[PDB]
Amino acid sequence: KELVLALYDYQEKSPREVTMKKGDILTLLNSTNKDWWKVEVNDRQGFVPASYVKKLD
Q1: Residues 47, 39: contact at Cβ < 8 Å?
Q2: What is the DSSP secondary structure assignment for residue 53, as one 8-state letter?
Q3: Of 57, 54, 15, nearest to 37 (Cα)?
């Protein structure tokens, strides 16, 4: 698709979230929410804080 860049690390705090590290490059799955975007990291899917990633495109 698409791609975002993780600007910060994020540990999942809930069953529909996913973990990411600074610098990771993620596939954006759904950005229809203002606060949480669904991303695919590496074989994992779930939401992160929208503003902890940046679009590239």
Answers
A1: yes
A2: E
A3: 54
Resolution given for this structure, in angstroms: 2.5
* Residue 54 CA: distances (Å) to CA of 15, 16, 24, 44: 23, 20, 11, 19
Q: Give me the residue spans of the domains in the chain.
A: 1-57
CATH number, domain 1-57, options 2.30.30.40, 3.90.190.20, 3.40.50.720, 3.40.50.970: 2.30.30.40
d(CA 43, CA 57): 22
Do residues 55 and 32 lie in contact, with contact meaning Cβ atoms separated by under 8 Å? Answer: no
- In DSSP terms, 54 is beta-bridged to 5
CA-nearest of 15, 13, 11, 23 to 53 is 23
